[PDB]
Amino acid sequence: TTPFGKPMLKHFCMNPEYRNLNAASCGSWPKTVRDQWRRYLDDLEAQPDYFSEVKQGPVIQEARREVAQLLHARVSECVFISNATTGIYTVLHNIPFDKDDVIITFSTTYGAIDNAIASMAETQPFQTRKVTVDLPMRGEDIVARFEGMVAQIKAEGLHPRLAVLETIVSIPAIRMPFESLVQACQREGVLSLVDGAHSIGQFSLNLEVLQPDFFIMDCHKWLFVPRPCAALYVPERNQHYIRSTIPPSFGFIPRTATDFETIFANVATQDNMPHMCIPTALKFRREVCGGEEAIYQYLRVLAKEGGDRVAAILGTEVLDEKEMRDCGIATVRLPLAVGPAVHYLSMTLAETHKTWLYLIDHGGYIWVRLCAQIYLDTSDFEWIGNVLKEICET
């Protein structure tokens, strides 16, 4: 109905002087979602205990049905949680680990996941090993080293029990061969904890075929809902491990919904408004945007072309292999070689240029994460490209 690009800007609530090239952080949602937000806000204030005990429940169950459909998985396998950190931690904490189990990570593993595991080892006797990924790589070369580390764990007598994978590495942001890595995890009896914080709403996902052991994802990062909003997927063959939420509450389980579902329903006080907006956003995505596939192909090609376009203006490169760019994200190199410098950038991109990006010192050179969105156009990449060029020269 509406074309992609700046014609979409009329359906979003962003200042015309604002260009959200970092939409996958706070999120970004259309006007029709905010309107729904305020109306639930209105209801909550009018009759608090009626909104919460009668009307709230149904909407959440619909949102679960729509997330489950978008993922090709049973609504009974999908549960709402506050954010990706809580869901990955919920899984890591329920699994009993032995003195001889090993948890495998990658140097790409999100930093908060490493802090989870380090803390778990203070009072639990398991151990850990990190697969060295120095980006760029080939997808297979990451799978190979992962194979090598499992083989070597079985050779020392220990037991490779679980591995933390990711779909999109946070930053430097690219797409990991998680399809291949889940299959590698299946062959050798290793639990595949997929950190798919960037997944739903950015590209297609079939959990029926992927069959991960656990799948966690942030809806607010790409599904046009506000932060915080995340969901957890656990197949039936694994729902027996999950016996408590984090923090524990009334649905705990000592050693017609299922018990698994009740665990994630009888929880402490939270605001389920972000989830209650999920339906509206999907409606918008179906009707105004021409369906999910339309949005995915646009996001990948914009990031493809807009990414190559920024690197041209700067004379640098977009992170790749020698497809890790099958996604609406382009990480570009910058003509650089400390933190007070990076600060200037930020507020020049903020008060001076009105926009916010995330940088990283990889390969000794600072990088930039460019987030595509259906309301951005290759000029806004040309625009930032020229903006970057300026601050760099200074």
Ligand X SMILES: *Cc1c(COP(=O)(O)O)cnc(C)c1O
49 binds ligand X (CB under 6 A): no
- Binding part of the chain for a second copy, among 62-70, 143-151, 186-194, 262-270 by CB under 8 A, reads 262-270
Residues 216-235 that bind a second copy (CB under 8 A): 218, 220, 226-228
Check binding of 86 to a second copy (CB under 8 A): yes
Q: Does 261 bind ligand X (CB under 6 A)?
A: no
Determine the straight-line distance between the first and last CA of the chain, rounded to whole angstroms. 44
Residue 269 is labelled as binding a ligand: yes
272 is a contact residue toward ligand X (CB under 6 A): no
Of 146 and 383, nearer to a second copy (C-beta) is 383
| Residue keyed to tokens 């957890």 | 232
Beta carbon of residue 329, minimum distance to ligand X (angstroms, whole number): 10
* Strand order, beta sheet including 359-362: 329-333, 365-371, 359-362
Among a second copy, ligand X, none, residue 170 binds (CB under 5-8 Å by kind): ligand X
Q: Verify binding: residue 157, a second copy, rule CB under 8 A.
A: no
Ligand-binding annotation for 123, yes or no, is no
Contact positions with a second copy (CB under 8 A) in 8-27: 13-15, 18, 20, 22-23, 25-27
Taking CB within 5 to 8 Å according to partner kind, which of a second copy, ligand X, none is near residue 198?
Answer: ligand X
Cross-strand pairs, 30: 12
User: Which lies closer to ligand X via its Cβ, residue 136 or residue 248?
Assistant: 248
Cα distances (Å, whole numbers) of residue 278 to 32, 36, 80, 223, 377 = 11, 10, 11, 8, 25
Q: Which tokens is 110 given? A: 């999100």
User: CB 6 → ligand X: shortest distance, Å?
Assistant: 27
| Residue 269 sits in the site that holds ligand X (CB under 6 A) | yes
Question: Interface residues for ligand X in 65-94 (CB under 6 A)?
Answer: 83-85
With CB cut-offs between 5 and 8 Å by kind, which of ligand X, a second copy, none does residue 27 bind? a second copy
Q: Find, among 92, 108, 59, 120, the residue nearest to 278 by Cα.
A: 59
Among 136, 248, 290, 363, binds a second copy (CB under 8 A): 248
Residue 196 interacting with ligand X (CB under 6 A) = no
Tokens of 175: 């797409």
Cα separation of 160 and 154, whole Å?
Answer: 7
The window from 137-145, 264-272, 316-324, 326-334 that contacts a second copy (CB under 8 A) reads: 264-272
Residue bearing tokens 């290759």: 378
Distance CA 174, CA 215 (A): 18
Q: Does 101 bind ligand X (CB under 6 A)?
A: no
Give residues in contact with a second copy (CB under 8 A).
13-15, 18, 20, 22-23, 25-29, 34, 37-38, 41, 44-54, 82-86, 88-90, 96, 111-112, 115-116, 118-119, 122-124, 218, 220, 226-228, 243-244, 246-250, 252, 254-255, 268-271, 346, 350, 354-356
Give residues in contact with ligand X (CB under 6 A).
83-85, 110, 166, 170, 195, 197-198, 218, 228, 268-269
Which residues belong to the annotated binding site for pyridoxal 5'-phosphate? 84-85, 110, 198, 269
